Design a binder for these strands. Structure first.
Ligand SMILES: Nc1ncnc2c1ncn2[C@@H]1O[C@H](COP(=O)(O)OP(=O)(O)O)[C@@H](O)[C@H]1O
Ligand SMILES: [Mg+2]
Ligand SMILES: [Mg+2]
Ligand SMILES: [Mg+2]
Lengths: 312, 50, 312, 312, 312, 309, 313, 48
DNA sequence: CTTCCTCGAAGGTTC
DNA sequence: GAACCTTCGAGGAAG
């Protein structure tokens, strides 16, 4: 596998990585389970990978499930009974599971026991069942989407963030070794600049540049070759994809920068409005290419100069 | 008496009467409590994996 | 456990405690339930805890649920049939319970009867139920968001305010005494001042600084260790959260201080309107960082002298 | 009990009582059922209470249901099939019924028949159900939601008015007897003037004062115990809350009596736009403290003497 | 009885009554079924009554059902297929039928056939069902709610208008002979002029005065008894209720006639915005007491001379 | 009968009628089936009538069903199995078919074969050359992939006074009534451009002529018969004339809102907007504006008032 | 040709065609299957035809299925056994597959083996089935509803585009050889310009012009006949129908460009709300003739200069 | 062979087939001696 | 998936 | 230019 297995191997995320070390070793000194941890941030930064490292650093058997995989209380109650003292339970998309399940999870995290009420009318009873000590690790794409009373149960908050050019250049070179790719230290920087901060993207671009270098070249990835290959893949120097370039070009040429409504824009470019607002707008907003107003979207000055058009 | 309780608990958790019957009926231990029965009917029905 | 058990253990909220003492004591001479009590105010101020104290003072059981968790009118009827005489039912976020469910409380609270349809098809018939005497305790963030018919049935209303430094300082000293730890009086004051006037935050931070002082320090908390440990976390030198920084750092740069509508601001920072207006805005206003205007919120001079900008 | 059961015990509403007495006496002489009657008016004035009194005067069993309990035509047909000659059917909150079910009453209310579909589906035909004589009693807080063809079928309309101080004083005395608490006539008038003319509010204050008068009073609601207790609840001598008092003060201290706009004033008091207009302003205008004008609203002389400022 | 049965007993509606006489007589000379008739207009003007008259004059049996009873195509295919040559089918509240059902009538009305899928599985087949000649009659208050292809198929359209003082006077005398009461001609006109032009309202006032005349009088209605009873009901000589007078007075004594907005007036009378606009405002405008303008409501000279003020 | 049988009997629709004649003649010359046709437009113009003419002009046997009656895939498969070479399948109100059925039909229209799983089992069938004809008033409700498979589109238009005048004369002879040339034109003017409405007035006038007359329609009988029905010489009904009058005499021509105007005539808000206004706007008697609606100069001239801007 | 066998025979799509050529050649230089490929684009552009050409270029057999036709895991697993080493599996409408099958595809794509867990508790076991390497080719019109785990398995993305006049013209010319009719190059261009960039729409106009050319002419489609044929049909030199022209004229002549609401516009042209919003409005937006605003539709300057009316800000 | 039959039939049921139809599907195979892998492979291949 | 209804913007008058 | 009133248009959520 490509993913790291110990903190001394995990590149980047120095803040999150440094905080967890203190809390993990402190918990060992006390001989007790780690507090419930919530991981959040953009997709593809390494949230799932970190979960395995925590279990290895603790020295515990990891157990995994996901939000959509739990459909009834019996599923969660069963999994919780199959736990062993100190086990770490990782739940992807902890915000996606059905609300009827959350009612049971709140008891477990807080009391470490569940109490199933049974009977009606003249009959009314409850069975009190103890649970072993454990730690819940959840991962989500947004922190505000999760149920507010649940969020208060997570003691440790880990905010992931985009990697920097020094980290991405190291990851690109490391991957090139696994594939036995000859890459110069300058070409590695070219892909890192255009991978827009996400390791998943940097790895996918490299796999595509390899094929080009084996045909349009001598199998040696030079900076001169890497730059030609990226123009063939239609990737901008800032990393804007074909769809991102289509959005900006349309706003400037057909609407003079706006304001323009989402419905109009999403009908001009043949794309579903649900995709534009979810997969593409967030990067354009964070990087400051687009602004949102009550009248519609607007192209900033930075965008006007980047595409190469004279501003008004 | 624990049979009616265990079966009723598993029904409350969302198991249908058919499976709740089979689950509790598959386990048998005259000295087991309704608590240890519930902790057995589920542990006996979950697919452990490695 | 951390949670207080009796009014003599509950610190602060003297105005509310003083009133509830009289009514609870009077409700003990006569053999009757306490009137339906509504608690409202900012989150984390200790209103769920108050419910447990009232229940322990009356000597009855406490059942708990939340508005959003109730899906249909048949759900609430099933709960009310399972309450013993004098039990207390606590409903969090009662202002968000669906209208189809709220319609049922009007009769249950005033006369202790409910009309419902039972059976199906040829068997369908109307039955008139009797509810054993019970007390409803509601919690809401927005005192004015409840409907006029529901608000008129609550016989007692309690407004819960932020805690003062003498109160928070003692809460930190109490919490650092349940855990085996030693904290100097000056460190307790600094940690309280940094805790947004909220007990939940003060507990969460203290629990984390316990780890740092046990690994990176001498096993004792001092101002020098508190200032360092609070700097490894994102807590600002005057308690502002990292989200608070984005808000101020955006209004001053993207809007020149405002005015700006909180609706458009929320979507530009990628935060849910409801969370920012309920949790963050109230503190920033009551501390003079943001001022209200008809056109929207405006960043005050106090923000410029804090973020290091020029108040041009 | 608290709710009166006969017209001799029912204080006030003389205009409604006078009409109903003549119609009930005339109906008995002919040995016929009473015409359908509709009760409407503001909350808490005694509508639901009157519906039961009518049943005791007619001397028949009262069947009971509610607008939100009926979900589909099958329910309404089942309820009507259980009727007996002369039965009274009370439907509280009738404005909540769905339109498709409300239109079933159009025949039942004047032709006494219903069209139903019966049979397995191979053979199925329409048939007339025939109903025994019955009287429908409806009560609603807002009659404008009832369709025009429904309101036209009700034969007797009762509009509830607010209570005056002479009549509201007698309600407080009657309730003190049921609680077995002695109250001086001087004090009964002090609670009546603060009850906003509503019986429900007068009962709520009397219960709160009753508790205080026995936990630290001497068991008698004298002229001085009432003032000490009502000062703790923070109810002004005109029934103004802290919010109501704040409004009048701000207009006089910061605007010289106005005119001031709704948006301008709301910001100066940190109050939500619609809350000020729906929750608070209505009572202030009705009592004459505030006056609406084409250029804004103005505080009258009455609002000056109540606050002690010098009117000019 | 209370409903007329022949055009001799049907007072008024000269336009609609004259047209139906010619169409019925012509249909008899050719010995063929009457064309499809749609009856619509305000509530209480004689729509359902006319449906039974047409059936008697044609000399055929009438089959009756209602829109809320027909829920699926299987029901309509069951009512049809039970018709005999020359039958009349009367559907009341035809606007409630689902549109997925209305499209089945398109073929039945124009060509007297329907396409039926018969059998199931491999036996499923399409076959024509052929209907005998028949006349569909429909009555509705919301004609604009029907589909354009359906309204286009109704061959006769009857719009009902309000009655006048001569016709309403005779109606009151006729009804006064179904019950056994003597009524002076002068008293009959006094009740007619107060019945807003609607036969249902005239009958209701007569029933109410009957009760008073037999309880508070000698059992006969004369100008003395009528004027006393009409004072208890508090209905003026123009049919203005108690709240109708309060609205007009407020406009003339506080705003000098206006203009005034709906909201500003509602609060001054303690009514609610939906009751005033839907229950009281409609008749005041239709009779010329109030005029609606871009700036608000204004009282006309006709209102000044009714309340007795000076039209300055 | 009332429904024409051939193009030689179908008056008007010169655009749609001319186009179909070219496509039908070409298909016959090649001995091929006619392409799939979609007929749509306002009510009463002739959509269902034209569907039968196409079958007679082609000389084929017409199979007929409707959208509301077809409720599951098993129903459609049974019908399709009965088609022979050249047959025509006509589906009226095609906009009501379930979505689970539209996906099956647009496959059959492309490749003439079906393979669908209907206790579940697969059934495969091959279809001969056939023509599908659909008629609908809500063409925009059909799925976008289905509209792409239709090869001929016919949009219907309203008729002119010469077309309606000849229709009235044709219908009058089926009822064996006598009518004059100038009396027919007085009914055409009032028929709002629709054949169904012109046929309705003729039936209502015939009833009056038989009872209140000699059973013959003439320039004098029509004057009296149309006064009883109260239909203006522009086709305005009683409520149509009352709306324009109220606007010109109480609001000085507007602007006024839909709510205010409705309360003043004692009509429901949805009846005015959905039943009376559509004709007044298309004839140019009323205009909608951001602040309300106003009566145009054409209304002043018709009602007989001195116009003032 | 209309029925192509190699990338040399495929008209248009030069961008996606040039990329896949480099990837296939590199995959051939190793004993490896081509990476899983995902094709994006609007409906009707040729995604099915391209999948076939990919297989022939690879020299491999092609299997076809669809998302809706797959209802249980056993359906998909049975098809995978039919794949020979290197075979291509094409799944249409892959975004509609039920999650119960989606969770099974991950291991087949990532590891080329499937695990079938069976038993419970002390009887828990799993069987293992080896699968020959294969390339999954997916096509979907909607990407915003694919899950992130599925998205991460696809490594090659392709975006389809509307055809352009210099190549859509060749499709018309070629189609005229399936029928037996002569068409002049200038006439072919006038048909391509009005076909909205979709091959399916260009075939429909050709059939209609053919019928006219052999009943009203000499059985030859020259520029003189094409003008008459396109004059009988309403289609303008921009592809606008008669009703499309009526909408723009109405907005410009009666409302001064708007804003105007959907309901007010519908009653002027005598059509249903859903008909204008779903049939005619979508193309007018793509062409840039109208915008949608919180206050209603508004006409742009591009529409004024096309209808031929003077314009003012 | 009952071990492989029960295992292979059970795995075939785990793929969503009904117990009745799943039992017939494997019962329809001739060779009993071949391992569960062969039974499921042959069963699904024949059922294609 | 469909009917309803409410949140929001902007045209016009008045001091 | 601040404050009120009316009218239209597109969402969205409870059936
Ligand atoms: N006065 C107090 N003294 C001690 N601990 C408190 C006090 N108020 C709150 N807490 C603690 O802080 C947390 C408050 O949570 P909770 O009462 O649920 O707040 P909310 O109800 O607003 O969510 C609990 O952990 C509780 O023990
Ligand atoms: Mg009540
Ligand atoms: Mg009726
Ligand atoms: Mg038709």
């Amino acid at each position: 596998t490509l993913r790291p297995q110990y903190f001394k191997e995990y590149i980047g995320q120095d803040k999150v990585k440094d905080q967890l070390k203190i809390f993990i070793e402190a918990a060992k000194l006390r001989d007790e389970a780690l507090d419930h941890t919530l991981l959040f941030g953009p997709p593809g930064l390494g949230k799932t990978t970190m979960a395995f490292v925590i279990a290895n650093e603790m020295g515990v058997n990891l157990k995994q499930t996901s939000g959509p995989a739990i459909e009834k209380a019996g599923d969660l109650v069963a999994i919780l009974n199959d736990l062993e003292p100190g086990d770490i339970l990782f739940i992807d998309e902890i915000h996606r599971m059905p609300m009827a399940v959350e009612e049971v999870l709140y008891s477990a995290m807080e009391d470490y026991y569940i109490d199933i009420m049974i009977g009606a009318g003249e009959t009314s009873r409850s069975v009190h069942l103890d649970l072993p000590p454990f730690t819940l690790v959840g991962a989500t794409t947004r922190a505000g989407m999760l149920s507010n009373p649940l969020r208060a149960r997570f003691g440790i908050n880990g905010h992931m963030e985009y990697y920097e050019l020094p980290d991405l250049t190291e990851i690109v070179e490391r991957t090139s070794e696994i594939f036995e790719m000859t890459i110069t230290p300058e070409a590695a920087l070219e892909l890192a600049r255009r991978s827009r901060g996400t390791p998943r993207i940097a790895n996918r671009l490299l796999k595509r540049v390899r094929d080009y270098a084996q045909i349009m070249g001598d199998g040696v990835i030079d900076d001169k070759i890497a730059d030609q290959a990226l123009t063939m893949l239609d990737v901008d120097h800032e990393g804007l994809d074909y769809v991102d370039q289509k959005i900006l070009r349309t706003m400037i040429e057909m609407y003079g920068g706006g304001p323009v409504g989402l419905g109009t824009l999403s009908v001009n470019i043949a794309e579903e409005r649900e995709t534009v607002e979810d997969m593409y707008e967030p990067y354009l907003i964070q990087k400051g290419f687009i602004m949102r107003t009550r009248t519609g979207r607007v192209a900033t000055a930075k965008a006007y100069e980047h595409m190469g058009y004279d501003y008004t | 008496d624990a049979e009616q309780e265990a079966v009723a608990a598993l029904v409350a958790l969302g198991y249908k009467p058919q499976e709740a019957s089979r689950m509790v009926s598959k386990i048998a231990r005259p000295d087991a409590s309704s608590e240890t029965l519930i902790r057995d009917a589920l542990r006996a029905a979950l697919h452990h994996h490695h």
